[PDB]
Amino acid sequence: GLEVDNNSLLRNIYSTIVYEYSDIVIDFKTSHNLVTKKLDVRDARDFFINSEMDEYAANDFKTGDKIAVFSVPFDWNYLSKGKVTAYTYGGITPYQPKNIPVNLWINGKQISVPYNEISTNKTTVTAQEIDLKVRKFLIAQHQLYSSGSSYKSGRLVFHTKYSFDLFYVGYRDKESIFKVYKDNKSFNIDKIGHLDIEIDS
Length: 201
What we know:
Layout: H1 3-13, E1 19-30, E2 33-36, E3 40-42, E4 45-52, H2 55-58, E5 66-71, E6 73-77, E7 83-89, E8 92-94, E9 98-99, E10 102-106, E11 109-111, E12 119-120, E13 124-126, H3 127-141, E14 153-159, E15 163-165, H4 174-177, E16 186-188, E17 194-200
GO molecular function: metal ion binding; toxin activity
Protein name: Mitogenic exotoxin Z 2
Keywords: Metal-binding, Signal, Toxin, Virulence, Zinc
């Protein structure tokens, strides 16, 4: 509710680990979920990723398709013997480097962002991938969600406009906060002019 609590909440939420795999086959595809085949082994067990997405978005994929994954999980299942499945939202692009210029304003003042701050080697990249890379950067270099930070609002805008509210807290958990990635929104790398970011106290 209060600024302090929201910062601690989001700082923790966005400290969550990110999964990045460039070539995996879809084992199962249902109306609104994609489940990968084994990605690798984590803590001695077969690791699989389940992606939940709008039916409209899920319609683009089918079992057997080769895809790339870039997403953050909100749950895990260890109930399966010798296996662990992580649940995520979207983060799926067809199997296949470029810097994306960033404009940043903090409390009304424009701040320079280095040329190579945000990049991706995909031709079709999800808004999720970019948002995760952006927040990681803002947390590490501009005190976003840091204790003792006065920030209370902000947004990341994709200037092709699509955007993410940097202080959306939903039901105060990963399941609700990462749900904004459910649309599996993506862009062709060449159609993204730059990213506009604003953070305000």
